[PDB]
Amino acid sequence: YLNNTLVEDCVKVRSAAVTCLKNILATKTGHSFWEIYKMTTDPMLAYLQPFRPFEGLDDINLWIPLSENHDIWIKTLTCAFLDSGGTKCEILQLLKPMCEVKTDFCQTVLPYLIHDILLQDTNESWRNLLSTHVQGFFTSCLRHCCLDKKSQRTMLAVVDYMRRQKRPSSGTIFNDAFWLDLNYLEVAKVAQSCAAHFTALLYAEIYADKKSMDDQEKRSTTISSLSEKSKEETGISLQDLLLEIYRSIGEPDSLYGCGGGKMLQPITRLRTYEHEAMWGKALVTYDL
Amino acid sequence: ETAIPSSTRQAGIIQALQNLGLCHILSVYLKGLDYENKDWCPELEELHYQAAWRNMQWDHCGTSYHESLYNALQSLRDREFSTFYESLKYARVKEVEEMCKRSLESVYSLYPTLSRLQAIGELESIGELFSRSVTHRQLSEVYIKWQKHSQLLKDSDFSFQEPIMALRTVILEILMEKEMDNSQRECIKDILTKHLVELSILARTFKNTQLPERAIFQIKQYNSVSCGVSEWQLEEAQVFWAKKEQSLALSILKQMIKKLDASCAANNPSLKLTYTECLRVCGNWLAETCLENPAVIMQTYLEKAVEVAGNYDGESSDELRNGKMKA
Numbered sequence: 001y002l003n004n005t006l007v008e009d010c011v012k013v014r015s016a017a018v019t020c021l022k023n024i025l026a027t028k029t030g031h032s033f034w035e036i037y038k039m040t041t042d043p044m045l046a047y048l049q050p051f052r053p054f055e056g057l058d059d060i061n062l063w064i065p066l067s068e069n070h071d072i073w074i075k076t077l078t079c080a081f082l083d084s085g086g087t088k089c090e091i092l093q094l095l096k097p098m099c100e101v102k103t104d105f106c107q108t109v110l111p112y113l114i115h116d117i118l119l120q121d122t123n124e125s126w127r128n129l130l131s132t133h134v135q136g137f138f139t140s141c142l143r144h145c146c147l148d149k150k151s152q153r154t155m156l157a158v159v160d161y162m163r164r165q166k167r168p169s170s171g172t173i174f175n176d177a178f179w180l181d182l183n184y185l186e187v188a189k190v191a192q193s194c195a196a197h198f199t200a201l202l203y204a205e206i207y208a209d210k211k212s213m214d215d216q217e218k219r220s221t222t223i224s225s226l227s228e229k230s231k232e233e234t235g236i237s238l239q240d241l242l243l244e245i246y247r248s249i250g251e252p253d254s255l256y257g258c259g260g261g262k263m264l265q266p267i268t269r270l271r272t273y274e275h276e277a278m279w280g281k282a283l284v285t286y287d288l
Numbered sequence: 289e290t291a292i293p294s295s296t297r298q299a300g301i302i303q304a305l306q307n308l309g310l311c312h313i314l315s316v317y318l319k320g321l322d323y324e325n326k327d328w329c330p331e332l333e334e335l336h337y338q339a340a341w342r343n344m345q346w347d348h349c350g351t352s353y354h355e356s357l358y359n360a361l362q363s364l365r366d367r368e369f370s371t372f373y374e375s376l377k378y379a380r381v382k383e384v385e386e387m388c389k390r391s392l393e394s395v396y397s398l399y400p401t402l403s404r405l406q407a408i409g410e411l412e413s414i415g416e417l418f419s420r421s422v423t424h425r426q427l428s429e430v431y432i433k434w435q436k437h438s439q440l441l442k443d444s445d446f447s448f449q450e451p452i453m454a455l456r457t458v459i460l461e462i463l464m465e466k467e468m469d470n471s472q473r474e475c476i477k478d479i480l481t482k483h484l485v486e487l488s489i490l491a492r493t494f495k496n497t498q499l500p501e502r503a504i505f506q507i508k509q510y511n512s513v514s515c516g517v518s519e520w521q522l523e524e525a526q527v528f529w530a531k532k533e534q535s536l537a538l539s540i541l542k543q544m545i546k547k548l549d550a551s552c553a554a555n556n557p558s559l560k561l562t563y564t565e566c567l568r569v570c571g572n573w574l575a576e577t578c579l580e581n582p583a584v585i586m587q588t589y590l591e592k593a594v595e596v597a598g599n600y601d602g603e604s605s606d607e608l609r610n611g612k613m614k615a
């Protein structure tokens with residue numbers, strides 16, 4: 001990415017990029033990278049040959065200063081994360097001068113620095129704080145607050161990247177998807193607001209599995225029970241979100257599973273009428 | 289088709305919208321006609337007044353029958369009786385003279401006039417009842433008289449009965465609107481619900497599904513669900529069955545059965561008879577659609593209904609023996 005951003009017209013960005021090249025390329029990590037990377041047949045070797053803590057993060061305003069200030073928000077998040085002692089790798093510490101002027105770098109390295117910080121977390125000290133802050137951010141987004149889609153899509157990308165990270169302890173992909181203590185219904189609704197139907201459906205399934213596991217361990221459960229429990233606790237009905245996902249995705253026969261053709265609520269009846277192209281009764285239903 | 293002259297094309301469109309259960313759409317369409325067309329012909333003005341009184345559009349301001357009916361309804365809503373009685377008398381005189389001026393010779397032509405005069409008489413009776421006060425016994429006797437007369441109108445056509453039912457619904461809505469909070473309000477609400485369900489069966493027997501749906505919507509607007517489901521849930525299930533929505537009706541009826549058989553506690557014989565009717569309806573539906581083998585559904589529904597009816601037949605009432613015979 002540094003090589004890609006080194007060839008732009010702006011001079012500050014390329015100066016920062018070459019300084020980063022000189023910094024990381026002079027470390028032992030750069031030497032090990034060169035030793036591993038010398039065997040491949042890539043002209044990048046020719047290109048790069050000549051170049052050879054919790055107090056500062058707890059702030060409700062710092063996490064959501066989103067009033068047409070997405071770039072400032074990501075920049076200040078990156079600065080506050082790098083200045084803390086959580087970061088350990090030199091390459092994850094010396095990127096400050098360049099990321100301050102490049103907007104896309106902050107977005108593309110925020111999940112990397114988050115994962116690096118959570119790797120060295122002890123006794124879930126950082127895990128709980130980050131989970132609470134991310135949950136608060138999602139709740140703020142769900143407020144009726146009119147935030148630009150860039151923040152939600154960046155957070156969805158971060159969550160998707162963190163879902164693919166292997167847990168240091170023994171576990172499965174189910175434990176991998178729960179790197180942070182979150183309920184995925186809110187993230188699914190956010191993805192629905194961003195037209196990310198597949199990710200929203202996956203997150204809804206993950207949340208349903210988590211609720212089922214929690215109920216099973218509490219005892220040691222139909223779709224309507226889960227929907228009413230989500231409405232009571234979270235405030236958002238899971239059944240309606242699943243119906244919206246199955247309708248907007250265009251799948252032929254998927255809305256009937258969530259209650260299509262068997263739900264007394266007028267909304268489901270209207271959705272079924274639209275899906276089955278029964279416009280004659282649909283118009284009567286809308287008027288009625 | 290645009291070749292039809294607008295003199296009758298607009299009337300046909302309005303009639304089709306009325307018979308399709310569309311009220312707000314008809315109101316907006318009529319407002320658009322008023323915007324695009326300035327002058328009003330007698331026929332379209334009469335249809336406008338009919339839609340105004342039928343939809344309770346009190347915002348909109350010789351006189352036709354529908355105009356006189358709307359004026360009488362507005363006067364009744366304003367606690368004015370002199371103009372109300374005068375308007376009803378004028379409507380009666382106009383209808384009688386218009387009917388007798390023609391050559392007659394046809395029985396079928398008498399039916400609309402008879403229906404209009406019956407509506408005027410019903411409004412007169414309502415005004416007499418509401419002249420000074422309303423009591424439970426008076427409302428009960430009025431409702432039983434109306435039900436008896438509707439029984440006399442079983443063989444009549446739905447076209448001549450629909451205005452009567454619409455006027456009755458409007459009257460009950462007006463009484464509900466201007467009723468103080470007491471047990472009388474509950475009695476009027478129950479009477480309104482019963483009238484709406486009777487209208488639902490009346491329209492269902494004439495291959496109509498939009499008016500029963502509107503009646504169920506009004507019931508849901510007024511009545512509320514509870515632990516013990518009433519007969520209007522069963523009526524909604526039947527209406528959805530008539531709309532070729534077999535799955536939804538079956539699911540609703542199964543939910544009703546699950547609610548009834550777990551929280552019956554012999555609270556009311558009416559609940560017992562409606563449970564028996566629901567079981568019989570479910571058995572008939574499963575027999576007709578054949579979603580399951582007869583062996584289990586028969587024992588689950590038909591014998592259960594038979595034994596429920598036979599275990600509490602100590603009153604020998606007609607409303608129980610007819611249900612037992614039907615089961």
Ligand SMILES: [Zn+2]
Nearest residue numbers: 143144145146
């Ligand atoms: Zn907002």
